[PDB]
Amino acid sequence: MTEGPYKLPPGWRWVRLGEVCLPTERRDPTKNPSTYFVYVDISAIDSTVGKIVSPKEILGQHAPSRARKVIRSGDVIFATTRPYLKNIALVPPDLDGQICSTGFCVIRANREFAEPEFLFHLCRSDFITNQLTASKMRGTSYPAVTDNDVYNTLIPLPPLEEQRRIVAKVEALMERVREVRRLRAEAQKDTELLMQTALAEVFPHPGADLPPGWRWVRLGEVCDIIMGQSPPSSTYNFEGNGLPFFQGKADFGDLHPTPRIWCSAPQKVARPGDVLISVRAPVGSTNVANLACCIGRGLAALRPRDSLERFWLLYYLHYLEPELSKAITKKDLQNVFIPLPPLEEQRRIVAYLDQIQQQVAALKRAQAETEAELKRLEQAILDKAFRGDL
């Protein structure tokens, strides 16, 4: 209504960006051929945080044709090409009187109405991007975004004092985001070390001391071992005839293999529970069977006897992966020594390792890629800022 795009706190007002900007000028550095100037092009900007980080000092003689807009301390420069990339930055004082590409719209705050830092953060918002119509679907001969298009966008305008307060809150919030990323990185490192340390303790070299009552056994003693075989070609089908067939490591998923092809003549069978292990090319890699299935040349299946927990075996094989990864013969597998606690202690220790393993996995995923996390979290902060909610 009278409220504009959305309702602002008391005392704020809606204006076009241009209404709080000043005129800007151009200069041809080639007119002082022996004079160095500093040039800010698109490549000079880190779009993730909106900072001029790599401008180039250039001899006037060699000024690029786009090098014509004079920038001043506190200007915001806003690329009119691909605006969604956020090549948008605040000009520091060291760059006063230097030059940026004509590809930037130069937004110079009229300090009677707007703080440069407030304009900078405002201009990084999707709220501005989303107003630039020439960025949306284009028909024949539609012009690209112009400087006037940018100056014409609507912006919420608090009093100067509140602008400065909002700038401080936005910058502090963004710094906390960085702090958390660093912390996560540290946790990832320490948690991985924890897992590695825990496995090394419970899985000592054969013959090493084990708590009384544990025994060193050969896997063959507490595990049925089945070497996979290639059935006759022509017994494979996709009609669900027989059992899913897994040739080798390639046919393994994150934890369990997913059925792709069947074999009507199941030769070597693995059941739910059994651990699958690659005995071929990438030796030692592991999965667990979740369905009755059959295995080929590339796999062995290990079926724990009653004195051995599936997951104790799995952790051990994973811990041994570097050794196992130098084919693998039945006798090899049967001859592997494993320390064997009573079932209750295997389960107690597996519960502990499971907690760490889940934490390592979570920490791995919780670290989002940098450019995306920073740009989209920035946007969520700006949305709060420009509604008056900070």
Residue numbers in the entry: 1 to 326, 335 to 398
Excerpt from the publication:
M2S1 is also the core DNA-binding component of the R-M enzyme.
We report here the crystal structure of HsdS from Thermoanaerobacter tengcongensis in an open form conformation at 1.95 Å resolution. TRD1 and TRD2 exhibited very similar folds. In TTE-HsdS, the CRs were found to be composed of two long antiparallel α-helices, forming a coiled coils motif. A three amino acid loop (Gln375–Glu377) is inserted in the CR2 α-helice. And there is a fifty degree bend in CR2. Although both TRD1 and TRD2 have similar folds in the three HsdS subunits, the overall domain orientation is quite different. Compared to the EcoKI-HsdS computational model, significant bending and twisting of the CRs in TTE-HsdS crystal structure enlarges the angle and distance between the TRDs and also shows a small range of rotation between the TRDs. The potential open state model of the M2S1 complex was proposed based on the structure of TTE-HsdS.
